Amino acid sequence: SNAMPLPKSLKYGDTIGIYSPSSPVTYTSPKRFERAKSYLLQKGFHILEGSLTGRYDYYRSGSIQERAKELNALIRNPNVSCIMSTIGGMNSNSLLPYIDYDAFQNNPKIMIGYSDATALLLGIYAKTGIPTFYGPALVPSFGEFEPFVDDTYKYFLETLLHDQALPYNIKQPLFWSDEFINWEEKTKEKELRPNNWISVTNGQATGRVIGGNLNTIQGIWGSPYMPCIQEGDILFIEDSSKDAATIERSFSFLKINGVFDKVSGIILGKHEQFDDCGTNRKPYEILLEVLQNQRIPLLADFDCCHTHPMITMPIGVQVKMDATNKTIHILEKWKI
């Protein structure tokens, strides 16, 4: 395709602005927050704390208007190169009518986070056409103890800072964990589980990748902030810390919306701490029941979700997915 507007690559010493569009994690998990900031500061970045850092409004950081103001102040700040959520929650979608999309279009930046921040990552892409990034949120991702935080950091640098020739191969992490330990304080080493991706349904697909957190997508679906899924797109979806009933609802939501009639392939993230409700079924097995007799190439257990470590994934750019050989390549520039 034609060259398009893109954000500048991250550079050492750049300022990362952090904001809390939903849960007040900088108040409720202060140790992991302080550790995450120090991790990135020690690497040589600067952190600009958004205006709701340290504030507390129970389930949220502040009112809808306060949270929009926090994010817009970073969007409008020409000294900020990367805007990163501290954590998700449920309520990022409340901000969407109030975000300064024109200011973002005037001065594009790296927009990164995951889970509930999907509402904003997809909303910005929908309104501006600028690719956004499914990737680290400050406290869950960079507050992680060694060793996994170093793998997450490596992928973050490789995708956002290093120059990359195209096609850009996304390598499989060698080890993973989803253990529900070591949140504020470390009590033992997480298991270094040997890692694999899964070839659920063979084949290849090339298309624009669209998606993120599927639970969160249901809170923006149908609105101006949800990019239209187009014939040939690759669907990227993940859920984390849910159960079989919840993800069957979300998979059937996609099915009855015709999404599976359009997409050329599906990338499914790992499912942290999945509750199979006694069925012993895997998330991809429930998805495949929803798919019925429709064959779609499908690569599962992709490391772009709440499990550690986390890949940084551009959204809104052409990708090739090979479910038979379990490869993912990015085919279009996502940064200058």
């Binding site: 998700g88 969160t216 859920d239």
Partner: peptide
Amino acid sequence: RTGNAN
């Protein structure tokens, strides 16, 4: 967590 958060 007791929550339904993402």
